[PDB]
Each structure stands twice: as C-alpha cells, then as structure tokens.
Write a protein that binds this ligand. Sequence first.
Ligand SMILES: Nc1nc2c(ncn2[C@@H]2O[C@H](COP(=O)(O)OP(=O)(O)O)[C@@H](O)[C@H]2O)c(=O)[nH]1
Ligand SMILES: [Mg+2]
Length: 155
Amino acid sequence: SKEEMELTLVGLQYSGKTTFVNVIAVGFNMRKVTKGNVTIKIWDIGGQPRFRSMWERYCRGVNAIVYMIDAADREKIEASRNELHNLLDKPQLQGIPVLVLGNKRDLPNALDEKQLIEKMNLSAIQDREICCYSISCKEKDNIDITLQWLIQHSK
Ligand SMILES: Nc1nc2c(ncn2[C@@H]2O[C@H](COP(=O)(O)OP(=O)(O)O)[C@@H](O)[C@H]2O)c(=O)[nH]1
Ligand SMILES: [Mg+2]
C-alpha cells in the first residue's frame, strides 16, 4: 500500500552520497525518490568537517540512517569509523536503524563486508538494527538489495 519514508544520508566527503541518490533517482540536498510503492525523502548531507555538527539534527526522526563509506579509501576508514560511532552515541538517535554501505566495490583494494564490519567496529553498535552491504554506484552493483532493505524500513 502507498507509503512515504525518510532517510538521512551521511558519511565522509567523497564516499559517494550524492552519486548514490543520482543512481537511485554542498551542505544539504533534499530529494524524493519513488520505489516499490514507497516515496523516499532523502537528506543528502555534507560530510566535510564543517557540516558534521549538523548530522544529528538531520538524523532525528528519520526511518533510517544511511552511512556511506569509500570502501577503497582505506586511509579514511579510521576517521569514518570515528564519525559513525560519534553520531550513534547521541541519545536522541537511539534505536534508528542504520545501513552502512561500503561503496566503490568496483575499485581495486575495496574492503568487503566482513572487513568493513570489523574495521568499522559495527559489532559494538548495540542499541539498534545495523546492516552492512558492499555496493558500487558506478556499476549499479548491489543497489537492488540496498533499496529492498530501505523499503522494508518504511514502517
Ligand atoms: N569508482 C567509483 N567511484 C565512485 C562510486 N561512487 C561515487 N564515486 C565517485 O566518487 C566521487 C565522490 O562522489 P560523490 O557522490 O560526490 O561523494 P559525496 O561527497 O559523498 O557526495 C565522485 O568522483 C564519484 O564519481 C563508485 O561506486 N565507484
Ligand atoms: Mg555530495
């Protein structure tokens, strides 16, 4: 039956947030995308240091948080891990499901799902449902399963 849901998309700069929205369809960009009888309102929020203080506010009240990672940029994983754990530590975000996406699977040296889970310390995240997929926006790889997970959280 016809529904609407809301997602906030975060993660470091260059991880592929805006690309992902483009494939599925600056400080902020809001877009609505319709899939599987569901209209998804997406907040694509900047990942540069100066925008990270606004992540919490944009995440409050959403159906799901999508956390984008450049899985091939291994140097940035530590920072990515830190920002994700710092975000999920904010009490007002208690219990919101999080989908962690290891983007750029098409590139040499891309971390797989196991490596992302371990290196991002996802297993430590206890208050909520958390999922992690390896994807390529460029080659449209594992985009379908990502959309299915999102739609399943339309509530
Ligand atoms: N090889 C590859 N490049 C990607 C992929 N997704 C995004 N990119 C590239 O990564 C760069 C940053 O993407 P963008 O969507 O601007 O990242 P944002 O800063 O998180 O919004 C751009 O050059 C994209 O073309 C992917 O799946 N594979
Ligand atoms: Mg962007």
